Design a binder for this molecule. Sequence first.
Ligand SMILES: OC[C@H]1O[C@](O)(CO)[C@@H](O)[C@@H]1O
Ligand SMILES: OC[C@H]1O[C@](O)(CO)[C@@H](O)[C@@H]1O
Lengths: 490, 490
Amino acid sequence: GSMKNLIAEANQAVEQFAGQVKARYYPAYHIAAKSGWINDPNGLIYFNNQYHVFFQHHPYNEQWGKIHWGHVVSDDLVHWRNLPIALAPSQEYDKDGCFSGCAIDDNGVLTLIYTGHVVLKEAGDKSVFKQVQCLATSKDGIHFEKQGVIVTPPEGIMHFRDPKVWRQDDQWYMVVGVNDHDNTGQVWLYHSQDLYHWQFVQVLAKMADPNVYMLECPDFFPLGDKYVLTCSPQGMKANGYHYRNRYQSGYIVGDWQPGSAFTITQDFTELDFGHDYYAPQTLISHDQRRIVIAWMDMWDSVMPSQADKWAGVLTLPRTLMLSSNNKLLINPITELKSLRGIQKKITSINLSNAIQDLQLDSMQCELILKIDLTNSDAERAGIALSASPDGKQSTLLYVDNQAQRVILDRTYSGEGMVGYRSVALPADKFLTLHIFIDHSSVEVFVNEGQATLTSRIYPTSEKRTLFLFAENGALRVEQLDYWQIKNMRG
Amino acid sequence: GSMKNLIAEANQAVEQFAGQVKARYYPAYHIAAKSGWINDPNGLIYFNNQYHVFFQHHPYNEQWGKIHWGHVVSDDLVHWRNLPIALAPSQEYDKDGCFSGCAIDDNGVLTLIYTGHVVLKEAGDKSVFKQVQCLATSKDGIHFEKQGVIVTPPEGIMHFRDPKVWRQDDQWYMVVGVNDHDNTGQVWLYHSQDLYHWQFVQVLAKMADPNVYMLECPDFFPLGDKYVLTCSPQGMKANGYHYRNRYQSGYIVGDWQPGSAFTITQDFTELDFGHDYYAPQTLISHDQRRIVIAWMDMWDSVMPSQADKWAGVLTLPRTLMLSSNNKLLINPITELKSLRGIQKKITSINLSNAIQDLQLDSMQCELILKIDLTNSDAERAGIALSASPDGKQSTLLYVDNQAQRVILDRTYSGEGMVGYRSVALPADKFLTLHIFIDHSSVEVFVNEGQATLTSRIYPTSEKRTLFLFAENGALRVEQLDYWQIKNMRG
Ligand SMILES: OC[C@H]1O[C@](O)(CO)[C@@H](O)[C@@H]1O
Ligand SMILES: OC[C@H]1O[C@](O)(CO)[C@@H](O)[C@@H]1O
C-alpha cells in the first residue's frame, strides 16, 4: 500500500527478471534498467557531486505499464550504476503512473517535480485521464517522499505534462506540454516563489503547423545570447527527409527575458536525423556544459529486446553549443574517452568497386572515420557496421553521391525495422563520422556536431566485424581511428 | 578481299556462333545480332515501305572489334527480321571500321553516309586514327557499294564522326561530332548540293562545360516550332542525380533556320535517367512521328551476355513530342501493342509493411502500374521486377518518399552491375509506370512521357515473377495492367 512497500515489490520484480536478460542487445555503456521497460529520461541533475538520471520505468515486464521512476547515478556522466526505484504510483493523483518530470535543488533538498497520471475512463486512444504536476523530496538521494499536487490544469485541458523547472530572478519557472482547447500542441510557462503555488505566465511556444496536437517534454534554457526550447512534437507529417519518425524531437532558438514573448530566430529543427531519438532532457554539468540525454527508441517500433525480458535505452549524453548561425552543434561528452581500450589507427585506405573486412570487433566500439568527399566519387561508399563475417547482415553507413547525403540503412541490420535515415553532406572537403556502436545501437556525430544520426539495430550474428565498401567508383578514407569501449558498469 | 567476300565471311561467323546463344538474356522483342557484338543504331530510315535499322556490329566475337553495319528490317517498327551484314571494313579509308552514320533517300537510291575509321598508330587511348565521312549505295536494300570519301576534316582535327544528313531547301545538311583544336566537343554543320562535295557552314553547338571533349552521334531535326539537337557528350562529370552513366545522351531545344545561330531555349537535358541509354538516332515514320532508337547498353559496363557469345541490344523505338515548356515527352510507339498476349487486370491493391507475389511471369511482359502518391506514404513502396520466387533476387522499381524520387535499383537483379538510377516524382496525384521487361532489360515510361529509365538486368533464376512491396507505411496501386509480350521474330 505505502510507496516504500510498492518500491520494494518493484525492485524485487526487476531483480527477479534480471537473470533472464541476454547480453546480445543489452547495452555495455548506455543506461538501461537491470530488466523490464524504460522510456523517457527524467530528473536530470548535478546534485551533491553526482549526476542523477531517472527514467520512465515499468518494473513488472518488458512492456510499457504503471510507470515508476528508475534511477542511475554517476560521478562522471559515464560510469552509471543502477539504484533502487525512486517513485512508484501510490496516490489518487499518480495511481496510473509517475509520468515525466525534472529535478531541482531546493536549498539542499533534492526535489522531483513530475506529472501524476490517472485514467478516469478506459477507451483506448479515446481514454479520459487526469494529469497534474506533483512534488517529491529526498534527504539522501535514494528514498523519496511525495508532497502532493502543485499544479492543476484549466477546465477542459487534459494533456498537461512533462514539467521542467529552473531557478531565475529569485523565483521558479516551469514549462509544461499542453493540448489546448482547439487541439493544438503548446508549451505553457508557469512561475512560483515557493514550488507549491504556481501562476500561469504565458503560452511560451506553439508551432505554425495546425496538425501538431501535443508538444511533449519541453526544456527551456539559455545558450549563449539566446534561449533554446527543446520539445517532442506529435502530429508533424513526414515530408521528404523531414520528420520521418512516428514522433519528433527538436529545438527552437530565439530571444526571451521575463515579461517578453519568446521571439523565434531559428524555427523547429530536428535534434537527431536517425530512427531512435525521443523525449530529450538537459542538465548543466559541474563545468557549466549544457548536456542532453534522450530515449534511444521510438514509440510503436518493433523492439526485439522484449524477447529478453527488457527494453529501453538512453542515448549517450551530448553537449549543446550555438553555432554563429544559431544552430546546435551536438558532440559526445569528453568523459566517454575514459571507456576507451585497445586503440587501432589505419591511415589512407582506398577502395574502388570492392569490399574489405577490417577484422575489428563491432560489439562495443568507437570509430572516427574521416572521408575525402572530393575523391570519394563512388555512387555508394562507406562502412558496414555490426556486420556478420559473411557480409550478409550489416548496418550501412555511407556517402550516397547521387543524393549527396550520408545514409544510415538498417534494412540488413538483423531483427526488427528496415529502411534508412539521412543527413545532407556537410559543405566541407572532409566528412568526419564519429561512430559509437553498442550491442543494439549506432550513434553518428557528423563533422563538428553539425548533425547526428541515432538508430537501434538488433544483429543476430555471433561475431560482429566492420567492412569498408565502394560501389561504382572510389572511397578515400584519410584516417580510421578505432577503440574497443569498456562496459561502463565494470 | 572484296567487300562481297568480307560480308560472306562475317555472315558465316555470325551464323556459326548463333547456335551457342542462350535465351536467358537474349531479347524476345528488342534488336540484337543473331550472335556477336552490337553497339550504336545507324542508318535509321523509312524506305520503300519498310523500316531499316542498321547498327555497329562485330561479327567475329561478342566484344567490340573491326566494326561492320548489321541490318534488320520491319514493316511496323516492331517485327524486326535479321538481314545479312550491309557494310564490312574493306578500303584504306574504313579499314578498322565502318563507324556510325545515317541513311537518306537519294532520288530512289538508299544511300548510307558513315564514318570510315583507320588506326594510323596503335597507342591505346593515345592511338592516332583518321575519321572521314564516306558514302555507299544500294539498289535492292540488302547489297551496298562503297562510293568513297565525301568529307575530310581540317588539319589537326582527328575525332570527326557520326554524320546525320537530311534534305532541306533543295540541298543536303550534315551534322558531325568533333573534338576541336582546344579539346572541346562540338557539332559542326556542313552542306552539299550533290552529296559528294561538302562545305563547312557553322559550329552548330558546343557545351558551356569546358571538360566536354566530344559530342558523339548528333541528330538535328525540327519538332513543332523548334529545332532539337540530340547528342552523346563525353567528359560531363557525374553531379548528384545528373550524368551518372560513363557517357551521356541528351537533347538541346532551340531556334534555327539556315544562315542563323542555333539559339538555345532549353539547355542539355538527359534523354533517359537509367543505366543503359547511349548514341540515340531518330527517323520520321510513315505518319510523320519523330522516332528515337538508342543502344540499350553503356561503354565499360560488365556485360554478362558475353559468356553466351553475343552482346548489345537496342532500346524500344520511342516517339518524341515537345511539351508546352519545350521538354521532350517520350512514349513507346503504339505498334508494340501488336505484341500483347494474355492480359491480366488487377484494381485497387493496398499493401502496408508487406510483400505480395503477383504470380505473373516476368520473362517478357508489359505493365501499366498506376500509383496513388498521396496515399502511398511508405518510406519505400513499388514492384520487384524479374524476381526469383524466394524474393532474394529482383529489380526494384519504387517510390522513395524520403528522396521523393522513383528508384530503379539493380543491386539484387542478378549478374553484373549494382546500384540505382532515379527521376524526381512528377507533380501529379498519380504516378503511372509503363514498364517493358525483356530477358535482360527494363524500360520505364513515367506519366505522359515526362521521363524514362532504361537499365540492363541479368537475372539468374529459372522462374521470374513480380512482387509488390510496402516498407514503413502504405502502397496504394489504383490499377495494374499486365500483358505477356510475344517474341517479335515468331
Ligand atoms: O511514460 C509517459 C511519458 O512519456 C511521454 O509520453 C513521452 O515519451 C511523456 O510525455 C510522458 O510523461
Ligand atoms: O563503334 C564506334 C562508334 O561508336 C561511338 O563511339 C558511340 O557509341 C560512335 O561515336 C562511333 O561512330
